[PDB]
């Protein structure tokens, strides 16, 4: 059992399966808490995650949540799934919501797991930011390529896929 | 008749005359669809554009619009009028709304037509982003200078003006 | 590829993972459509399922959905996960919402997959209804027992578990 861990979930289609990660990670960390981006609320009812994680940080329920306390309360902060938007906001120091504010404050404990279409992944500006993040000691996982169920056509093609738990653990703990 | 074209309209005072462009462009492209920034809705009733364009993408009516599908469905994507804000967001890979998300995904088919006060145009940060966009193959039209109606005084003066259709067509097709 | 299939999802904590079933089943049935109980909307944003299933029947969006048409449009109707409440309502012919109304109308194509705590499963009244359902040709799957994540403690224990796809397919097709 390692220290308290915080998941910063963003608006990737894969956020709908964030519960699988919470349950898995809860087997290795004292606490697994979660914080969502405003947009991810259009994909899932974040309320239900209260049943799996120790604490749910809701900036609407409480607009005055202390980001410093949140960062100090955790040893690890994971942006999972990490959207292109949030990755780019973090890289530019933009923090116009609680999630990004937490990421700016806790850049030293930040672990980013990118998830998006390979086409978005190729964006020049996104890539420059990913280099900037890495060159400034922010841990950015290298997206895995594999069979991904493309929602555009009910066909399994090759694209960026979500990281399995072994890889998440290894990237965060090693 | 060329391929399907998408207009990404932002919050410039000139967005109120976007209908003139839709009608003109509809004479040259199979389809002319439109997508607005959240803020531009304070300038016009976007609903009425449904009467001129083939399709109106509304992220409020449907928060789960697939940006990949939108980008794949068009051969050309125009940011017109393009605000300083959206230009700068695109340059930094920031995509916190559907319009900018579409622009990040379709950077390869992007054509930007800047519109703003000459004073805003002189902003250092805006200009660095415009160079960055150009140096990364994003087509950015050079704003025209000419006579314009100044809303504060109600009189005409020299300033950045909207591009006429010939110039739009030539910049997009050549 | 078999005929069109309808999923009638109820308010079981496991409804949050209903998307995994939709994707799996879509590989074997022409269409996989879904219909939720009013209460299950407290667990998930049902809107997102529109991205995985062919059709989403929403009695709030359309209060006048024809249950006869819905039943006639499918060869198989699965109550998955099936809550104790819905199971008991079906057994007594109670249909005070669209889901149960569809189940009463299509009892002949009904396949029920119970999911609930083993303690609830032992309820006398629930069990009498399960016998009544079986004795009247309504297919009721026998819940699997295995390791499960207990939300209250966050640890794993033996209890009723969700059916894997092989078992679902075999119970429905055989």
């Amino acid at each position: 059992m390692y220290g308290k861990l915080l998941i910063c979930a963003t608006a990737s289609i894969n956020v709908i399966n964030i519960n699988h990660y919470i349950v898995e990670l809860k087997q290795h960390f004292d606490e697994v808490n979660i914080l969502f981006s405003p947009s991810s609320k259009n994909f899932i009812n974040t309320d239900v995650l209260k049943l799996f994680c120790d604490n749910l940080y809701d900036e609407i329920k409480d607009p005055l949540l202390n980001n410093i306390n949140i960062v100090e309360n955790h040893e690890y902060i994971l942006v999972l799934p990490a959207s292109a938007n949030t990755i780019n906001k973090i890289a530019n120091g933009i923090c116009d919501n609680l999630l990004t504010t937490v990421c700016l404050t806790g850049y030293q404990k930040l672990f980013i797991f990118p998830n998006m279409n390979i086409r978005m992944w190729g964006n020049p500006f996104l890539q420059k930011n990913i280099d900037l993040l890495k060159n400034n000691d922010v841990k950015v996982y290298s997206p895995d390529m594999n069979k991904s169920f493309e929602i555009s056509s009910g066909r399994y093609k090759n694209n960026i896929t979500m990281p399995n738990i072994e890889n998440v653990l290894n990237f965060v703990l090693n | 008749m060329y391929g399907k074209l998408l207009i990404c309209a932002t919050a410039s005072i000139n967005v109120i005359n976007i209908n003139h462009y839709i009608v003109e462009l509809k004479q040259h492209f199979d389809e002319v669809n439109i997508l607005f920034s959240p803020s531009s809705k304070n300038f016009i009733n976007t609903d009425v554009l449904k009467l001129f364009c083939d399709n109106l993408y509304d992220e409020i009516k449907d928060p789960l619009l697939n940006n990949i599908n939108i980008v794949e469905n068009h051969e050309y994507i125009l940011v017109l009028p393009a605000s300083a804000n959206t230009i700068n967001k695109i340059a930094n890979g920031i995509c916190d709304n559907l319009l900018t998300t579409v622009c990040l995904t379709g950077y390869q088919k992007l054509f930007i037509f800047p519109n703003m006060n000459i004073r805003m145009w002189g902003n250092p940060f805006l200009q660095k982003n415009i160079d960055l966009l150009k140096n990364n193959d994003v087509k950015v039209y050079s704003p025209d200078m000419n006579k314009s109606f100044e809303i504060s005084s109600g009189r005409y003066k020299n300033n950045i003006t909207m591009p006429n259709i010939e110039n739009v067509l030539n910049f997009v097709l050549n | 590829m078999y005929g069109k299939l309808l999923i009638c999802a109820t308010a079981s904590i496991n409804v949050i993972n209903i998307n995994h079933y939709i994707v799996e089943l879509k590989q074997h049935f022409d269409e996989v459509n879904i219909l939720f109980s009013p209460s299950s909307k407290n667990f998930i944003n049902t809107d997102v399922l529109k991205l995985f299933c062919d059709n989403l029947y929403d009695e709030i969006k359309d209060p006048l959905l024809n249950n006869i048409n819905i039943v006639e449009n499918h060869e198989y109707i699965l109550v998955l996960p099936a809550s104790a409440n819905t199971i008991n309502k079906i057994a007594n012919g109670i249909c005070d919402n669209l889901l149960t109304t569809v189940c009463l109308t299509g009892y002949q194509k009904l396949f029920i997959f119970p999911n609930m705590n083993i303690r609830m499963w032992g309820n006398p009244f629930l069990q009498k209804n399960i016998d009544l359902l079986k004795n009247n040709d309504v297919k009721v799957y026998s819940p699997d027992m295995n390791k499960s994540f207990e939300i209250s403690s966050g640890r794993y224990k033996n209890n009723i578990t969700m059916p894997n796809i092989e078992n679902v397919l075999n119970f429905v097709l055989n």
Partner: peptide
């Protein structure tokens, strides 16, 4: 199962 747009 992993997803992509």
């Amino acid at each position: 199962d992993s997803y992509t747009c």
